[PDB]
Amino acid sequence: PTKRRNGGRAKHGRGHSAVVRCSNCGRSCPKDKAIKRFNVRNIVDASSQRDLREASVYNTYTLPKLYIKQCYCVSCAIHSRVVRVRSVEQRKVRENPQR
Amino acid sequence: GKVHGSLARAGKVKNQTPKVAKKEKKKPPTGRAKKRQQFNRRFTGPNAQT
RNA sequence: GAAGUUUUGUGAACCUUAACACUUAGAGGAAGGAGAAGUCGUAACAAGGUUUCCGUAGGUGAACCUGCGGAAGGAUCAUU
RNA sequence: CUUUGCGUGUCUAACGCAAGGAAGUUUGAGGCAAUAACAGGUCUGUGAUGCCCUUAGAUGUUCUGGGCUGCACGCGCGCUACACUGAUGCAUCCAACGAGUCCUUGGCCGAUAGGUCUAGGUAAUCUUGUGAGUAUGCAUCGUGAUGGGGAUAGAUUAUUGCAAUUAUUAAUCUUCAACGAGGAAUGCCUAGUAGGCGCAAGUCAGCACGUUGCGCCGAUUACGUCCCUGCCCUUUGUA
RNA sequence: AGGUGAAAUUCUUAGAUUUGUUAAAGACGAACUACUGCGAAAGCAUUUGCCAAAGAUGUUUUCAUUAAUCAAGAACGAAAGUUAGGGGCUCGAAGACGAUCAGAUACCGUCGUAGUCUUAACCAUAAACUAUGCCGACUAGAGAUAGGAAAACGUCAUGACUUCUCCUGCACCUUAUGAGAAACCAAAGUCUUUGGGUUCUGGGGGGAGUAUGGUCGCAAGGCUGAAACUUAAAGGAAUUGACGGAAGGGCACCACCAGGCGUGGAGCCUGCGGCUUAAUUUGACUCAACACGGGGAAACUCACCAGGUCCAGACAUAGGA
RNA sequence: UACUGUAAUGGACUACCGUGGCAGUGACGGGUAACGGGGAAUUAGGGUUCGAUUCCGGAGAGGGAGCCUGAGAAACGGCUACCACAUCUAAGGAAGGCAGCAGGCGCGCAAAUUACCCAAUCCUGAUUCAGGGAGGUAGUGACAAGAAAUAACAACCUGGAGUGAUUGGAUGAUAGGAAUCCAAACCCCUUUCAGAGUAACAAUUGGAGGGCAAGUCUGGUGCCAGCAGCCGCGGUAAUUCCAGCUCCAAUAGCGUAUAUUAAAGUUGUUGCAGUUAAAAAGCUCGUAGUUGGAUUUCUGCUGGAAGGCCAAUUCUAGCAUCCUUCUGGACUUUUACUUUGAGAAAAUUAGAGUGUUUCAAGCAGGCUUGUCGCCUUGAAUACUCAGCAUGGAAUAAUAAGA
């Protein structure tokens, strides 16, 4: 039986999508079915960054953020607990948890 | 199946069992007279042992 | 108008070669299923402990393994 | 009553901490114990029992004797050990649970065990206030398998029984091994608890190194966790 | 330095790995990238130019049934693979060692030829999938979205945005007295109240996409495609448990933690295997068998073994007395 | 095209001459455990399977070929030859054709008497008269179809009509006559002397776990023997084995095996299914094949003949501008379609009539002291794609475009 109406790849009127390699696994999955979290984050945590505010040259300084787009394999995600797993009813929701 | 199954025991229980004759009893009615008896004894399970 | 006889046609029957049809032997090779219980692993079913599977290619006691491109029948219907 | 105070919570259910108090983990510790079951165990607890066996040359019953204790060797619960926070000899003085138609004071005999003559007890009355032992005080011993250790073994004196040999025990003298803190594995346990130290009862004519209760001396370390080993409830996958 | 769960093979003072500026080489076009677009499907992401081609929209243009679906037959058809030349960075079936393991020709690691890329031929299959043939009609709404078109004294400067309608796309959400075996489904609806048109395919599971014959192919193999014998079930969708070296919770000293005291070592007591014996009566064998049967057995108990007794065999029928 | 040949037409055959004919709507070839049809079985309709066999065609007489006679034969109960079998021979020779009727051998799961007669039915002949294994009658016969014995009734315990061997008195199976039947026997139908009291003149065949109607019975056996179409019974208590007893089902029948039909909406035109169960070609073009939009004399009133029923429904003439050549047919593009009609053998099938005692059947009968007997006696009728004919306004092809 179909576990998803979608199939999990979210592809319509193509026949062929682009491909990406998983950032951890190595695996070629399709770009559409990859599962992607764009992790913006500053370099030195939060607690440790006050050392740089103390130590530095210049009156104030914006500690510049690190921008990366992670892409995952399904199996790499479910192992690493990005997505885990959901019920048959609650599967269908597509919104943002943590807006 | 294996061919070399032995044929010694063939006719065990036919030869084993104790013989006994049928009892002499008065004959049942036949044909129409039989269907008379079957009609009556139902309407005035069928085999009920002790 | 007889026997015999000339040349034609009708043409049985037998033989040679070939092809087609149908039975049938064969050292060795190599399948499938049946036993009823043996030897060696562990492949699949749970994320079956390297997710499973497809097409194709190569390799290995054996199940199988790995390369390239696919599929979810996935372990995700989902986050600038 | 978690009462009172202050935190913690949709301040709802209720938690934490401090004070007070005999006591604040539901105050501590037990009894009682659901629905489903498992081919668990018990026909050797039974006059609970179906079926089968056998029923006088007996698998009924009962008497004499042996056996369950028999030992090349594995495994499981316990006891005593390896010492000097100790062993030994003297003295000091303290428990609770029982239990008896047998439990035993009192006086003589005997190294001891034990015996003998009186004697109280149907028991909060008598044994019994059961003068229990780890403990305390004063001496000798000196790190030697030694006086730690008391197995193994000969010889003797009493006790129960109708009968003690394969020795029922208790004594007296000897005999004087292994073991110097235990390999890999793995058990039990959070306060009068662990551990140690005795006592009493059950089976019992006699025999506890066993079990079930009872006190005494009395610590160390957590007040958390899901890593191992299991458990309960959800979502999820299954051939 | 590399690399891993942890290490080694490997590279290194004849200067690696890291720092910087170049140059060459051949791949690949990140982020923007979406339940978006285009394409008959396979497929197609850098800039600019050239060459034809296509859909939708708009149209008070034009022809006037020219159409739908298709045995034969024909074109294209990812990846791998083949043939002949180029190119060869990285990755990398084979192969090579280094690990892991009982072994490990595998997973992991380090090198590494074919291949990967391109021109010229072939091949013709993929879970080539929406696992749903292609035209047509009608069924039900809401909000998004891509392309075109019309309207508004609309807002900011021919265009961006706002509001509203129209067709044409990929979809999505909600719901059905519509359907279904159910999962689910605006088609899988309008089908026992059974007929709009048409192409292809299937008839329990194996044997088997095998054998033989044919035909295409340079091969690998493709397309077509049986039987003997074998078998009572294969298969579909959901339900309840149990299990998972899956997730999220809450728990126990029969579990760890922090510890305390032990057993396992020694001798001895005692239970169970066995070995023994005339007999060593016998149950129970992970937690939940094994100082357990209240099982500390001299006889008794006693079930065992070698012997010896007694009938304590009612009563019915019958001989004998 | 022109001979030839034939009973005549023809590549039927011969000379010259042309290059055609058939095929994807299945030619050509192969298989058939294939003679064709009228028909048979099969319980909606549509179908599927069978048809050697009563009638009508066809072909054959061991295999092929040739031929005489005759109106007619490529004949075989006629002849000639070869091949394959086989008989007698005195060894030189001669004769044979049961897929006619019996009968035998052999093949096989599988099939009857070496019988009597032309009396019926018809046929042949020189024919009222002769002949006929055509044909009929009997024997064998559980291939099959039809009818229906194996008891019924009394008086003398259960009492809310059935049992109870307790006695009791009231038609043919059989055996032999009579007449009838028959060509001669025989059977049937009639009537006869004998002829049943455990009515010994005795009903069996398969089952009793489920499907499937009917025993948690009682012995024996112990995954043995065996059952069992499928699921399943049996390892020491068997609702399935081997027995006994009782009961069930069908009954002069019942079980088994093979093929076939329904069940099978599991071959699907009526009428299935193809997301995941079996199954949508990877995708477009495309020739046949199949299927194809709307639109072209519609409405109204007045008759006429019939007509069912206590005016509807048919059919038909006129009038709104509607042919004519004549005295019924010619024209209306052409068919399909539908309607009526022709012609098409019976048997079988459905079916009208009729007491073969009923019935399967059969085609007979029925009235009646009357005699040239009567019912001017019955044995009806339906059924039998393509072809011929015809009324008609739709539907659908097709033609066209003075």
PDB file of all heavy atoms in Angstrom, chain F residues 218-227:
ATOM      1  P     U F 218     -19.830 -45.910  25.458  1.00  0.00           P
ATOM      2  OP1   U F 218     -19.793 -45.900  26.943  1.00  0.00           O
ATOM      3  OP2   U F 218     -18.801 -45.157  24.694  1.00  0.00           O
ATOM      4  O5'   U F 218     -19.816 -47.426  24.972  1.00  0.00           O
ATOM      5  C5'   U F 218     -20.612 -48.426  25.636  1.00  0.00           C
ATOM      6  C4'   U F 218     -20.442 -49.773  24.974  1.00  0.00           C
ATOM      7  O4'   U F 218     -20.946 -49.731  23.611  1.00  0.00           O
ATOM      8  C3'   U F 218     -19.017 -50.278  24.810  1.00  0.00           C
ATOM      9  O3'   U F 218     -18.481 -50.800  26.022  1.00  0.00           O
ATOM     10  C2'   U F 218     -19.191 -51.329  23.721  1.00  0.00           C
ATOM     11  O2'   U F 218     -19.668 -52.575  24.187  1.00  0.00           O
ATOM     12  C1'   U F 218     -20.215 -50.649  22.808  1.00  0.00           C
ATOM     13  N1    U F 218     -19.600 -49.923  21.684  1.00  0.00           N
ATOM     14  C2    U F 218     -19.170 -50.670  20.603  1.00  0.00           C
ATOM     15  O2    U F 218     -19.287 -51.883  20.544  1.00  0.00           O
ATOM     16  N3    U F 218     -18.596 -49.942  19.590  1.00  0.00           N
ATOM     17  C4    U F 218     -18.408 -48.576  19.544  1.00  0.00           C
ATOM     18  O4    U F 218     -17.875 -48.070  18.555  1.00  0.00           O
ATOM     19  C5    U F 218     -18.874 -47.875  20.700  1.00  0.00           C
ATOM     20  C6    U F 218     -19.437 -48.554  21.708  1.00  0.00           C
ATOM     21  P     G F 219     -16.896 -50.996  26.185  1.00  0.00           P
ATOM     22  OP1   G F 219     -16.636 -51.509  27.555  1.00  0.00           O
ATOM     23  OP2   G F 219     -16.224 -49.753  25.728  1.00  0.00           O
ATOM     24  O5'   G F 219     -16.571 -52.164  25.153  1.00  0.00           O
ATOM     25  C5'   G F 219     -15.267 -52.775  25.113  1.00  0.00           C
ATOM     26  C4'   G F 219     -15.259 -53.941  24.149  1.00  0.00           C
ATOM     27  O4'   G F 219     -16.279 -53.746  23.127  1.00  0.00           O
ATOM     28  C3'   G F 219     -13.960 -54.156  23.383  1.00  0.00           C
ATOM     29  O3'   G F 219     -13.047 -54.958  24.127  1.00  0.00           O
ATOM     30  C2'   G F 219     -14.448 -54.833  22.108  1.00  0.00           C
ATOM     31  O2'   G F 219     -14.683 -56.222  22.237  1.00  0.00           O
ATOM     32  C1'   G F 219     -15.752 -54.077  21.854  1.00  0.00           C
ATOM     33  N9    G F 219     -15.578 -52.845  21.087  1.00  0.00           N
ATOM     34  C8    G F 219     -15.781 -51.555  21.518  1.00  0.00           C
ATOM     35  N7    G F 219     -15.542 -50.663  20.598  1.00  0.00           N
ATOM     36  C5    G F 219     -15.160 -51.406  19.490  1.00  0.00           C
ATOM     37  C6    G F 219     -14.777 -50.986  18.187  1.00  0.00           C
ATOM     38  O6    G F 219     -14.699 -49.836  17.740  1.00  0.00           O
ATOM     39  N1    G F 219     -14.466 -52.069  17.371  1.00  0.00           N
ATOM     40  C2    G F 219     -14.514 -53.388  17.756  1.00  0.00           C
ATOM     41  N2    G F 219     -14.179 -54.292  16.822  1.00  0.00           N
ATOM     42  N3    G F 219     -14.872 -53.792  18.964  1.00  0.00           N
ATOM     43  C4    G F 219     -15.179 -52.755  19.775  1.00  0.00           C
ATOM     44  P     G F 220     -11.527 -54.485  24.327  1.00  0.00           P
ATOM     45  OP1   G F 220     -10.871 -55.433  25.262  1.00  0.00           O
ATOM     46  OP2   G F 220     -11.530 -53.032  24.641  1.00  0.00           O
ATOM     47  O5'   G F 220     -10.892 -54.700  22.882  1.00  0.00           O
ATOM     48  C5'   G F 220     -10.572 -56.020  22.407  1.00  0.00           C
ATOM     49  C4'   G F 220     -10.203 -55.986  20.941  1.00  0.00           C
ATOM     50  O4'   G F 220     -11.261 -55.343  20.183  1.00  0.00           O
ATOM     51  C3'   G F 220      -8.954 -55.194  20.583  1.00  0.00           C
ATOM     52  O3'   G F 220      -7.768 -55.957  20.796  1.00  0.00           O
ATOM     53  C2'   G F 220      -9.186 -54.880  19.110  1.00  0.00           C
ATOM     54  O2'   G F 220      -8.797 -55.910  18.222  1.00  0.00           O
ATOM     55  C1'   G F 220     -10.702 -54.665  19.069  1.00  0.00           C
ATOM     56  N9    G F 220     -11.092 -53.258  19.128  1.00  0.00           N
ATOM     57  C8    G F 220     -11.716 -52.602  20.164  1.00  0.00           C
ATOM     58  N7    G F 220     -11.929 -51.338  19.915  1.00  0.00           N
ATOM     59  C5    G F 220     -11.415 -51.147  18.640  1.00  0.00           C
ATOM     60  C6    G F 220     -11.360 -49.978  17.836  1.00  0.00           C
ATOM     61  O6    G F 220     -11.768 -48.841  18.100  1.00  0.00           O
ATOM     62  N1    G F 220     -10.752 -50.229  16.610  1.00  0.00           N
ATOM     63  C2    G F 220     -10.259 -51.448  16.206  1.00  0.00           C
ATOM     64  N2    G F 220      -9.708 -51.492  14.985  1.00  0.00           N
ATOM     65  N3    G F 220     -10.307 -52.544  16.946  1.00  0.00           N
ATOM     66  C4    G F 220     -10.895 -52.323  18.141  1.00  0.00           C
ATOM     67  P     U F 221      -6.388 -55.227  21.172  1.00  0.00           P
ATOM     68  OP1   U F 221      -5.333 -56.267  21.282  1.00  0.00           O
ATOM     69  OP2   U F 221      -6.642 -54.320  22.321  1.00  0.00           O
ATOM     70  O5'   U F 221      -6.085 -54.335  19.888  1.00  0.00           O
ATOM     71  C5'   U F 221      -5.495 -54.898  18.699  1.00  0.00           C
ATOM     72  C4'   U F 221      -5.354 -53.845  17.622  1.00  0.00           C
ATOM     73  O4'   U F 221      -6.605 -53.131  17.470  1.00  0.00           O
ATOM     74  C3'   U F 221      -4.330 -52.753  17.889  1.00  0.00           C
ATOM     75  O3'   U F 221      -3.027 -53.187  17.505  1.00  0.00           O
ATOM     76  C2'   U F 221      -4.826 -51.604  17.014  1.00  0.00           C
ATOM     77  O2'   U F 221      -4.326 -51.622  15.692  1.00  0.00           O
ATOM     78  C1'   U F 221      -6.346 -51.812  17.025  1.00  0.00           C
ATOM     79  N1    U F 221      -7.076 -50.864  17.884  1.00  0.00           N
ATOM     80  C2    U F 221      -7.454 -49.653  17.328  1.00  0.00           C
ATOM     81  O2    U F 221      -7.211 -49.351  16.172  1.00  0.00           O
ATOM     82  N3    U F 221      -8.129 -48.812  18.178  1.00  0.00           N
ATOM     83  C4    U F 221      -8.459 -49.047  19.496  1.00  0.00           C
ATOM     84  O4    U F 221      -9.070 -48.184  20.131  1.00  0.00           O
ATOM     85  C5    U F 221      -8.031 -50.315  20.001  1.00  0.00           C
ATOM     86  C6    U F 221      -7.368 -51.159  19.199  1.00  0.00           C
ATOM     87  P     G F 222      -1.781 -53.017  18.500  1.00  0.00           P
ATOM     88  OP1   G F 222      -0.595 -53.647  17.862  1.00  0.00           O
ATOM     89  OP2   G F 222      -2.204 -53.456  19.855  1.00  0.00           O
ATOM     90  O5'   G F 222      -1.551 -51.440  18.528  1.00  0.00           O
ATOM     91  C5'   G F 222      -0.764 -50.786  17.513  1.00  0.00           C
ATOM     92  C4'   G F 222      -1.078 -49.306  17.466  1.00  0.00           C
ATOM     93  O4'   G F 222      -2.428 -49.081  17.958  1.00  0.00           O
ATOM     94  C3'   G F 222      -0.161 -48.399  18.283  1.00  0.00           C
ATOM     95  O3'   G F 222       0.171 -47.216  17.556  1.00  0.00           O
ATOM     96  C2'   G F 222      -0.974 -48.121  19.544  1.00  0.00           C
ATOM     97  O2'   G F 222      -0.676 -46.890  20.172  1.00  0.00           O
ATOM     98  C1'   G F 222      -2.403 -48.133  19.005  1.00  0.00           C
ATOM     99  N9    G F 222      -3.402 -48.521  19.997  1.00  0.00           N
ATOM    100  C8    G F 222      -3.427 -49.675  20.743  1.00  0.00           C
ATOM    101  N7    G F 222      -4.447 -49.741  21.555  1.00  0.00           N
ATOM    102  C5    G F 222      -5.142 -48.560  21.330  1.00  0.00           C
ATOM    103  C6    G F 222      -6.337 -48.067  21.920  1.00  0.00           C
ATOM    104  O6    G F 222      -7.045 -48.597  22.784  1.00  0.00           O
ATOM    105  N1    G F 222      -6.691 -46.827  21.399  1.00  0.00           N
ATOM    106  C2    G F 222      -5.986 -46.144  20.436  1.00  0.00           C
ATOM    107  N2    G F 222      -6.488 -44.957  20.063  1.00  0.00           N
ATOM    108  N3    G F 222      -4.872 -46.591  19.880  1.00  0.00           N
ATOM    109  C4    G F 222      -4.510 -47.796  20.371  1.00  0.00           C
ATOM    110  P     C F 223       1.626 -47.045  16.889  1.00  0.00           P
ATOM    111  OP1   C F 223       2.212 -48.396  16.684  1.00  0.00           O
ATOM    112  OP2   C F 223       2.378 -46.029  17.671  1.00  0.00           O
ATOM    113  O5'   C F 223       1.299 -46.462  15.441  1.00  0.00           O
ATOM    114  C5'   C F 223       0.743 -45.144  15.264  1.00  0.00           C
ATOM    115  C4'   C F 223       1.029 -44.644  13.867  1.00  0.00           C
ATOM    116  O4'   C F 223       0.087 -43.586  13.535  1.00  0.00           O
ATOM    117  C3'   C F 223       2.415 -44.048  13.656  1.00  0.00           C
ATOM    118  O3'   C F 223       2.880 -44.284  12.326  1.00  0.00           O
ATOM    119  C2'   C F 223       2.177 -42.564  13.915  1.00  0.00           C
ATOM    120  O2'   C F 223       3.127 -41.702  13.324  1.00  0.00           O
ATOM    121  C1'   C F 223       0.788 -42.377  13.308  1.00  0.00           C
ATOM    122  N1    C F 223       0.022 -41.265  13.906  1.00  0.00           N
ATOM    123  C2    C F 223       0.076 -40.003  13.299  1.00  0.00           C
ATOM    124  O2    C F 223       0.759 -39.855  12.275  1.00  0.00           O
ATOM    125  N3    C F 223      -0.620 -38.977  13.845  1.00  0.00           N
ATOM    126  C4    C F 223      -1.343 -39.174  14.950  1.00  0.00           C
ATOM    127  N4    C F 223      -2.013 -38.134  15.453  1.00  0.00           N
ATOM    128  C5    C F 223      -1.411 -40.447  15.589  1.00  0.00           C
ATOM    129  C6    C F 223      -0.717 -41.454  15.041  1.00  0.00           C
ATOM    130  P     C F 224       4.008 -45.391  12.031  1.00  0.00           P
ATOM    131  OP1   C F 224       5.083 -45.240  13.047  1.00  0.00           O
ATOM    132  OP2   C F 224       4.359 -45.311  10.591  1.00  0.00           O
ATOM    133  O5'   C F 224       3.251 -46.766  12.308  1.00  0.00           O
ATOM    134  C5'   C F 224       2.407 -47.376  11.309  1.00  0.00           C
ATOM    135  C4'   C F 224       2.047 -48.784  11.720  1.00  0.00           C
ATOM    136  O4'   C F 224       1.339 -48.748  12.984  1.00  0.00           O
ATOM    137  C3'   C F 224       1.113 -49.530  10.779  1.00  0.00           C
ATOM    138  O3'   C F 224       1.831 -50.159   9.717  1.00  0.00           O
ATOM    139  C2'   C F 224       0.460 -50.558  11.701  1.00  0.00           C
ATOM    140  O2'   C F 224       1.171 -51.773  11.827  1.00  0.00           O
ATOM    141  C1'   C F 224       0.408 -49.814  13.039  1.00  0.00           C
ATOM    142  N1    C F 224      -0.927 -49.272  13.370  1.00  0.00           N
ATOM    143  C2    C F 224      -1.913 -50.151  13.835  1.00  0.00           C
ATOM    144  O2    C F 224      -1.639 -51.356  13.949  1.00  0.00           O
ATOM    145  N3    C F 224      -3.139 -49.667  14.144  1.00  0.00           N
ATOM    146  C4    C F 224      -3.397 -48.364  14.006  1.00  0.00           C
ATOM    147  N4    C F 224      -4.618 -47.931  14.323  1.00  0.00           N
ATOM    148  C5    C F 224      -2.411 -47.447  13.534  1.00  0.00           C
ATOM    149  C6    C F 224      -1.202 -47.938  13.230  1.00  0.00           C
ATOM    150  P     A F 225       1.431 -49.896   8.180  1.00  0.00           P
ATOM    151  OP1   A F 225       2.400 -50.629   7.324  1.00  0.00           O
ATOM    152  OP2   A F 225       1.251 -48.435   7.993  1.00  0.00           O
ATOM    153  O5'   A F 225       0.011 -50.605   8.043  1.00  0.00           O
ATOM    154  C5'   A F 225      -0.098 -52.011   7.751  1.00  0.00           C
ATOM    155  C4'   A F 225      -1.408 -52.564   8.268  1.00  0.00           C
ATOM    156  O4'   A F 225      -1.702 -52.002   9.573  1.00  0.00           O
ATOM    157  C3'   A F 225      -2.643 -52.253   7.430  1.00  0.00           C
ATOM    158  O3'   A F 225      -2.766 -53.187   6.360  1.00  0.00           O
ATOM    159  C2'   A F 225      -3.769 -52.384   8.452  1.00  0.00           C
ATOM    160  O2'   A F 225      -4.223 -53.708   8.647  1.00  0.00           O
ATOM    161  C1'   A F 225      -3.104 -51.851   9.722  1.00  0.00           C
ATOM    162  N9    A F 225      -3.396 -50.444  10.005  1.00  0.00           N
ATOM    163  C8    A F 225      -2.598 -49.344   9.803  1.00  0.00           C
ATOM    164  N7    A F 225      -3.151 -48.215  10.171  1.00  0.00           N
ATOM    165  C5    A F 225      -4.395 -48.595  10.654  1.00  0.00           C
ATOM    166  C6    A F 225      -5.464 -47.860  11.195  1.00  0.00           C
ATOM    167  N6    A F 225      -5.451 -46.534  11.348  1.00  0.00           N
ATOM    168  N1    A F 225      -6.565 -48.543  11.583  1.00  0.00           N
ATOM    169  C2    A F 225      -6.581 -49.874  11.425  1.00  0.00           C
ATOM    170  N3    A F 225      -5.638 -50.675  10.928  1.00  0.00           N
ATOM    171  C4    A F 225      -4.559 -49.965  10.558  1.00  0.00           C
ATOM    172  P     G F 226      -2.904 -52.677   4.847  1.00  0.00           P
ATOM    173  OP1   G F 226      -2.939 -53.872   3.967  1.00  0.00           O
ATOM    174  OP2   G F 226      -1.872 -51.633   4.618  1.00  0.00           O
ATOM    175  O5'   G F 226      -4.362 -52.034   4.823  1.00  0.00           O
ATOM    176  C5'   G F 226      -4.573 -50.615   4.679  1.00  0.00           C
ATOM    177  C4'   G F 226      -5.872 -50.219   5.337  1.00  0.00           C
ATOM    178  O4'   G F 226      -5.630 -49.905   6.738  1.00  0.00           O
ATOM    179  C3'   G F 226      -6.549 -48.972   4.788  1.00  0.00           C
ATOM    180  O3'   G F 226      -7.314 -49.177   3.603  1.00  0.00           O
ATOM    181  C2'   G F 226      -7.399 -48.549   5.976  1.00  0.00           C
ATOM    182  O2'   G F 226      -8.581 -49.304   6.147  1.00  0.00           O
ATOM    183  C1'   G F 226      -6.419 -48.790   7.122  1.00  0.00           C
ATOM    184  N9    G F 226      -5.540 -47.647   7.344  1.00  0.00           N
ATOM    185  C8    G F 226      -4.209 -47.537   7.019  1.00  0.00           C
ATOM    186  N7    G F 226      -3.701 -46.375   7.327  1.00  0.00           N
ATOM    187  C5    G F 226      -4.761 -45.671   7.880  1.00  0.00           C
ATOM    188  C6    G F 226      -4.818 -44.351   8.400  1.00  0.00           C
ATOM    189  O6    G F 226      -3.913 -43.513   8.475  1.00  0.00           O
ATOM    190  N1    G F 226      -6.095 -44.036   8.861  1.00  0.00           N
ATOM    191  C2    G F 226      -7.176 -44.882   8.826  1.00  0.00           C
ATOM    192  N2    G F 226      -8.326 -44.396   9.318  1.00  0.00           N
ATOM    193  N3    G F 226      -7.136 -46.114   8.344  1.00  0.00           N
ATOM    194  C4    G F 226      -5.906 -46.441   7.892  1.00  0.00           C
ATOM    195  P     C F 227      -7.560 -47.952   2.591  1.00  0.00           P
ATOM    196  OP1   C F 227      -8.301 -48.463   1.412  1.00  0.00           O
ATOM    197  OP2   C F 227      -6.272 -47.240   2.400  1.00  0.00           O
ATOM    198  O5'   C F 227      -8.546 -46.998   3.400  1.00  0.00           O
ATOM    199  C5'   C F 227      -9.921 -47.357   3.628  1.00  0.00           C
ATOM    200  C4'   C F 227     -10.565 -46.374   4.578  1.00  0.00           C
ATOM    201  O4'   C F 227      -9.598 -45.952   5.577  1.00  0.00           O
ATOM    202  C3'   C F 227     -11.041 -45.073   3.953  1.00  0.00           C
ATOM    203  O3'   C F 227     -12.323 -45.206   3.345  1.00  0.00           O
ATOM    204  C2'   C F 227     -11.065 -44.128   5.149  1.00  0.00           C
ATOM    205  O2'   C F 227     -12.254 -44.181   5.911  1.00  0.00           O
ATOM    206  C1'   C F 227      -9.862 -44.614   5.964  1.00  0.00           C
ATOM    207  N1    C F 227      -8.636 -43.806   5.785  1.00  0.00           N
ATOM    208  C2    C F 227      -8.622 -42.491   6.271  1.00  0.00           C
ATOM    209  O2    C F 227      -9.638 -42.044   6.826  1.00  0.00           O
ATOM    210  N3    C F 227      -7.507 -41.740   6.116  1.00  0.00           N
ATOM    211  C4    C F 227      -6.432 -42.257   5.514  1.00  0.00           C
ATOM    212  N4    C F 227      -5.353 -41.481   5.385  1.00  0.00           N
ATOM    213  C5    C F 227      -6.417 -43.592   5.017  1.00  0.00           C
ATOM    214  C6    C F 227      -7.528 -44.324   5.172  1.00  0.00           C
TER     215        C F 227
END
